[PDB]
Amino acid sequence: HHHHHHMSKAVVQMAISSLSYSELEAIEHIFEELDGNEGLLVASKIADRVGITRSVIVNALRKLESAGVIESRSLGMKGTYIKVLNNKFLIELENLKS
Q: Which is nearer to a copy of itself, 13 or 44 (CB)?
A: 13
Q: Which CA distances in Å does 28 have to 7, 17, 60?
A: 22, 14, 11
Q: Is 2 in the site for a copy of itself (CB under 8 A)?
A: yes
Q: Is 85 in the site for a copy of itself (CB under 8 A)?
A: yes
- Residues 43-72, one symbol each (x = binds a copy of itself by CB under 8 A, - = not), give ----------------x--xx--xxxx---
Give contact residues for a copy of itself (rule: CB under 8 A): 1-11, 13-18, 20-21, 59, 62-63, 66-69, 85-86, 97
